[PDB]
């Protein structure tokens, strides 16, 4: 449901025990996202979709 918040600028997901962050493939819609924070999680591979 975060994919619909087109006006987001900061996303903080501290200590959410995120394992896979492949949902980055859907964050290109947000034209104002500048401060994606994913610290304090358990993520292995940064997805190729950062581009």
């Amino acid at each position: 449901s975060i994919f619909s918040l087109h006006n987001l600028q900061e996303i903080d997901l501290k200590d959410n025990n995120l394992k896979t962050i492949e949902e980055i493939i859907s964050f290109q819609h947000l034209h104002r996202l500048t401060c994606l924070k994913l610290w304090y999680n358990h993520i292995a591979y940064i997805p190729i979709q950062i581009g």
Partner: nanobody
Framework: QVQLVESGGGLVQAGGSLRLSCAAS????????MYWYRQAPGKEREWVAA????????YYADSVKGRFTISRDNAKNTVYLQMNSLKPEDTAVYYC??????????????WGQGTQVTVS
């Protein structure tokens, strides 16, 4: 509250397959290291199987490596253990163990009641 309990205890002659189980209360199983220990008459608690949190990697002792199978089922909030034609000398009382869950109070090691499985 935090408590550990397992089931599946039953005496089975050599030649069958027994499916153990467990039950964890008060914490998720994914964010915790679950352990299986064996207890035998006249013998102390010997480690058997361990499953690592945040990555789900299985760790086995050379005593029973390559025969057991451990899996974590977060749907039931439990840990399932399966044997593959365990030897008669493998009879023991199996203990579950989870240590240092996200909650940090005086009991740091939680053990199950204990189930006795017999092989003959």
């Amino acid at each position: 509250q935090v408590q550990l309990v397992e089931s599946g205890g039953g005496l089975v002659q050599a030649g069958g397959s027994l499916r153990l189980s467990c039950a964890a209360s008060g914490f998720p199983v994914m964010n915790a290291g679950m352990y299986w220990y064996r207890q035998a008459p006249g013998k102390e608690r010997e480690w058997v199987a361990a499953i690592e949190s945040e990555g789900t990697s299985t760790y086995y002792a050379d005593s029973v490596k390559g025969r057991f199978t451990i899996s974590r089922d977060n749907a039931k909030n439990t840990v399932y253990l399966q044997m593959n034609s365990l030897k008669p000398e493998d009879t023991a009382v199996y203990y579950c163990n989870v240590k240092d869950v996200g909650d940090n109070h005086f009991p740091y090691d939680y053990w199950g009641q204990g189930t006795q499985v017999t092989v003959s």
